[PDB]
Design a protein around this nucleic acid. Structure first.
Ligand code: MG
Ligand code: MG
Length: 326
DNA sequence: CCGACGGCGCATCAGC
DNA sequence: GCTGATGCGCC
DNA sequence: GTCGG
């Protein structure tokens, strides 16, 4: 982290644009810039040097010069002093409260953790559970605990049906020493792009995990995506583990490679890779890679039998998961 | 100078 | 009820 | 906010 001060500044600017300004492209621009700077292997000496990087432009170059000169950004200093901005940025830290909800709450005079805790009846289900585990959800998960969680998930799935395959993706699959949460990609031969020969495939799995008291809460749930809360069991006399966020995504089995590419991320890696596919004349989602026809309409799914095939199509050398942490 | 910026699941809501 | 838009979330 | 045509 040669440029930790700069990348934090940019991240804070990104969060402002997203949470307060509701300017999603400025949000993305700041995160692309932070990410390119984060991987740059030199300690940056000026804005000019930073501007050479793709994603850093004139405005960010200027902020970088101010930051190196003084150790801070007046623009951010003012934002931090603004009560409305501060309040909105705080509320959005609760899962389920976005930029619109936060600003709505602030209008109502709901703007602190205390306010929220006395107005539960004003939150939807997702928001109520996000509030419930607010502190827990900001803790990271040591890899060792991720390993225990993996063992539990993989073994409980196996107990439901030996044909399920569950893969932990996200920062875990990228080899991180700690994860923000647990991402599980699920496949079963009965669910392909061609047919759903068996209903309740995701449900059965979620139920078993609830049955054994691993999944403790649900934020949302459909046929292919579960978003919830889980907890490791604690030993006799031991403080409980924090509650953790868990996302489970059921992907057609024949589409596993596109699925696992998606769920491995990072998010920024994904946006960069997908943007590059476009530039090369393809479109990538978690199911397929397709050609763009002359019109601008996606064609039929190209054959894919490895993650690498996807990289090949867009003329990128393969990158192991450990190298996709953008 | 601008059009485009990654792609999609679930929950909620307006309008019919 | 549905469809389509929007909010929020996943990477 | 930045990039590419
Ligand atoms: Mg994760
Ligand atoms: Mg997740």
């Amino acid at each position: 982290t040669l440029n930790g001060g700069i990348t934090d500044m940019l991240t804070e600017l990104a969060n402002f644009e997203k949470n307060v300004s509701q300017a999603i492209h400025k949000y993305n621009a700041y995160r692309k810039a932070a990410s390119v700077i984060a991987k740059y292997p030199h300690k940056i000496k000026s804005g000019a040097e930073a501007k050479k990087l793709p994603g850093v432009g004139t405005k960010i170059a200027e902020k970088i010069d101010e930051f190196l000169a003084t150790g801070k950004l007046r623009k951010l200093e003012k934002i931090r002093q603004d009560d409305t901005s501060s309040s909105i940025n705080f509320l959005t830290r609760v899962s389920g409260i976005g930029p619109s909800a936060a600003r709505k709450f602030v209008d109502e005079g709901i703007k602190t953790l205390e306010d929220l805790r006395k107005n539960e009846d004003k939150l939807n289900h997702h928001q109520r559970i996000g509030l419930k585990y607010f502190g827990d959800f900001e803790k990271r998960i040591p890899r060792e605990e991720m390993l225990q969680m993996q063992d539990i998930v993989l073994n409980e799935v196996k107990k439901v049906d030996s044909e399920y395959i569950a893969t932990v993706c996200g920062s875990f699959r990228r080899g991180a020493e700690s994860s923000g949460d647990m991402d599980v990609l699920l496949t079963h031969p009965s669910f392909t792009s061609e047919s759903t020969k068996q209903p309740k495939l995701l449900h059965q799995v979620v139920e078993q995990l609830q049955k054994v008291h691993f999944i403790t809460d649900t934020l949302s749930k459909g046929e292919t995506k579960f978003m919830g809360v889980c907890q490791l069991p604690s030993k006799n006399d031991e403080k409980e583990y924090p509650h953790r966020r868990i996302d489970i995504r059921l992907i057609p089995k024949d589409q596993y490679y596109c699925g696992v590419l998606y769920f491995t991320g990072s998010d920024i890696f994904n946006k960069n890779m997908r943007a590059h596919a476009l530039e090369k004349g393809f479109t990538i989602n978690e199911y397929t890679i397709r050609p763009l026809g002359v019109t601008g309409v996606a064609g039929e799914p190209l054959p894919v039998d490895s993650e690498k095939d996807i990289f090949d199509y867009i003329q990128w050398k393969y990158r192991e998961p450990k190298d996709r942490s953008e």
